[PDB]
Amino acid sequence: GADDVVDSSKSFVMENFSSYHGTKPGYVDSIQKGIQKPKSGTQGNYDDDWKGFYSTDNKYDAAGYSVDNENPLSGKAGGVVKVTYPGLTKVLALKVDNAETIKKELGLSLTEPLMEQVGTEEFIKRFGDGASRVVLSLPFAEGSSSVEYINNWEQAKALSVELEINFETRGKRGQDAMYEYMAQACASCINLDWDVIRDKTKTKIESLKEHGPIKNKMSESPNKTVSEEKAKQYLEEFHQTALEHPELSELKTVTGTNPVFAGANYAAWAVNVAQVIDSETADNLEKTTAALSILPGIGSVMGIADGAVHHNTEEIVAQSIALSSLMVAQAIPLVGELVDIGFAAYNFVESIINLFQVVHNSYNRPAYSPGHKTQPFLHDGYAVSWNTVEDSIIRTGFQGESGHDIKITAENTPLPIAGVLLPTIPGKLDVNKSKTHISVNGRKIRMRCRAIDGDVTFCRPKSPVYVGNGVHANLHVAFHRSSSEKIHSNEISSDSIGVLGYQKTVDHTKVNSKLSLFFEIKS
Amino acid sequence: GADDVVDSSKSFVMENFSSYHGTKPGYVDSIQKGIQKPKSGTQGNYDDDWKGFYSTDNKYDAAGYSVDNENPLSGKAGGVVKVTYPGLTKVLALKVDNAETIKKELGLSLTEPLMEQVGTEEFIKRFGDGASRVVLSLPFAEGSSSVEYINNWEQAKALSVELEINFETRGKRGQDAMYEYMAQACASCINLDWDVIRDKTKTKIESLKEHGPIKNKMSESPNKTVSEEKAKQYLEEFHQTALEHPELSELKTVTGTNPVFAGANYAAWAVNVAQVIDSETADNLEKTTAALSILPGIGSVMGIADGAVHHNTEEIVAQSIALSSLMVAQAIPLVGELVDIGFAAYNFVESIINLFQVVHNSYNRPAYSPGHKTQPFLHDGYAVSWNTVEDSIIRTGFQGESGHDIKITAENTPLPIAGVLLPTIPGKLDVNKSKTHISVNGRKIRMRCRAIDGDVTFCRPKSPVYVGNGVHANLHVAFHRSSSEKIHSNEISSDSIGVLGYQKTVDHTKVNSKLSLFFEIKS
């Protein structure tokens, strides 16, 4: 019966039904000429039942689909278009997102893709209520109030497309236009001017560089490869000297307020950057970002602690970015490969501004339920937990696909999630690569997934993921059943899902923290 | 056109569309038999255009329509029923609530009432989008995100009616049941168990009456008509004496912490009660609430200051009510009537528990845009301002009706609002009595309006209204134009809206605080 898969309180027929779509660079304009199924690719979904044109009711969540796919962490943001169906459209809200159950319950052909059937005249006759087409609607994410729409590709052809925003038109550096647009969602609400910040930072670096005492501290540098401990201890002195520069007076004042802002954290974080940025990464902004994005300790330079963004002005922020930057340049000779020059003031600053931006976006957002609902596993500051007990089970007979939620939070300052390792049984239980994602305070982030050793699939978030006091995430795992064969309990290669946290040195080697949650493969 | 008065983003066709309606004591059962227009009465509205059956999407707002209309302040609540239309129903959201404009814009007759025209087959063929009937839809109130629905009376005969809650059935005391139902709204939540508070109040009273120092302080009472000063002087020493009983231990720790909590304030509140309670009033709970509800200083007793409910447990509350009760008993002889401590430990405490219930209900709600948008008129702690400049102008040629908003706030503690004096031109410009209301933090309060001298209409709120730090009101004035003959500026008798606040003594006479706002009759 339809009644088991459809929520009537969320289903309605509406005239001139509009929704937004995040558009990539290079498509903003062409997409205003019409919606059409791409000639190749996944055409909306890894699973054929779910291929269709996707939109959402919130233009800021649409904006989260606008960044250049080739350079997801630093690339350009395209835009957001509004798509409108002329006349009457039936929105049919689903209670489950299991295409199979949807076909069983709606009495559909289980041999034909679900979303293709949604565009048939008979489905429309049956479920449309006098409308011209039906658009399937599902919740957008945990910790989100938005909605996601799944349109039939043919039916999408009737959509009228207008521009909502073209981020590139602004002529802004990096992903400024995009994050400033999304910052409008809270009228919460940190919206710094990153241009003024870049200016002030640049100005202050030049100034600190010339400060008599700063230059003398500089002279005391080993300027050669010294131990991690020696490099950090010189940077704790370098930081102390520099915090007395009048252009850093306000920072100096806050530094004592929270232990998160200590000299010792500026030095641990500066040495760790130097250590992970080689000639190649330094020369690439996207690599630089991927590399900084997995370091622990960003709450010190960002002034984020105990669930609040303390460094909340273009000035204390410019002061913090300048000091750290200046510290990275000193740490490069002692621990890295390149030199003080270039990177420290260019790619380091640009790349770090994008991470402030991502973390501030989270804090401007409502906190995804702080509390663990099942006992969490704690490690290196993070706490991971199944959202519910059923999320922990893989029913051996599940048909179609299954979804699993796991709450991830960290205890205090911004700690990163590098990736997720998911168990598979190739050709029976596969990862659905379009539906697995992580939602941070409701912002849904897609993943890039690949096969690794032992029937495990490694998924990396598309943009940086940070959890902390105030910023919690939901990992949503979508499994696809590509075979009607029997799935046994002792048949899976792996029986857990791993969470990769920040990168730390173990055995003098950089590794990523790792928390595992185990599955119960059961009938 | 339709797009000039229809909000399409809020207009849709839904299957089995349900809403809620507050039901009075005696109708909770018969209403479930069917929605039928009363044989007599205003049947939904003072204005013919607007007569129809009213519902809302929110069951707690529906709850605010359940109280017996003979004893509005203290009578019992009946309940809420869910009304559902079978099949398909069109919801037509309106950008305006002027029926003339909606008729003119939707190309309706101007000779026939709007909601009557809403149930015709023609209107339905036109605006229904394939639905069996059309329901009008309007914002519920300022400071609220609820929806009001207005059904056509005959179309409403199709509604199936279900019980949602019957408060009488709960068997509780006063409007307890109604009030905890509403507390479910927010889980800002303070949901005291008043049954436990009624008992600890009783227990503290007795314990206090047998207290050594208490009884002797009592012995020192002049026990007879003395002045306001001597009565107040004795009562403060009384308070100190009682504030040292092991049982008011909690309340003592908190008396000194905030000035609002001082004995001097318990003593003044006590003298004012004893002064205002005569034998006739002391014998009627309804009349006790009305009397107590217009007094200043109730915040001493409630422990409410600086935008916080300090007395937030059933123990300090009982403690506070006990002490107040005793003091009220002591005050009765000195500055009151033969209405002694009988009233003190009974009606005054039942009456007082209900007003904590109203104020606590406002605090559990989201504070209505605190800022005054045009310069406020200040006075006796209150601040009243036109919502917008337009709300202050009565355009001479307005056709149909017009509404005006006034924000009302008080500076700190709970100050009441006794009523509002509205101007009129009795043939042409009338107070629409159904549409005129006060909205307190989104809680919508109806008015009982009467004609007074000088072409003024006095409107009283159906339930107690209090403003303060964190509880803001919007007074909504709905005028109705009874005549096409245009208005002349010097035609009108009063050119102001008067706000009546708390009761005070002027020239040994009890009068109410009064604030005025001046209208502008333009074109």
Ligand SMILES: Nc1ncnc2c1ncn2[C@@H]1O[C@H](CO)[C@@H](OP(=O)(O)OC[C@H]2O[C@@H](n3ccc(=O)[nH]c3=O)[C@H](O)[C@@H]2OP(=O)(O)O)[C@H]1O
């Ligand atoms: N004229 C056009 N008509 C149709 N598509 C066009 C057109 N021009 C460009 N496209 C792009 O084509 C894709 C498929 O429709 C979308 O981007 P993507 O990089 O594949 O977008 C990446 C993913 O985001 C989804 N997504 C995009 C935006 C949004 O707001 N919501 C959402 O879920 C896509 O379906 C896609 O899923 P899959 O990769 O799982 O296929 C879309 O923007």
Ligand SMILES: Nc1ncnc2c1ncn2[C@@H]1O[C@H](CO)[C@@H](OP(=O)(O)OC[C@H]2O[C@@H](n3ccc(=O)[nH]c3=O)[C@H](O)[C@@H]2OP(=O)(O)O)[C@H]1O
């Ligand atoms: N079988 C019946 N069929 C229909 N109505 C019945 C039936 N039996 C009793 N009634 C009552 O008759 C009135 C008209 O519907 C309502 O109460 P009221 O005391 O007049 O209710 C007082 C006012 O509250 C309005 N109001 C009530 C509840 C609600 O949630 N929303 C709303 O705005 C009413 O229209 C009314 O306006 P007017 O007072 O301006 O007429 C209703 O409860």
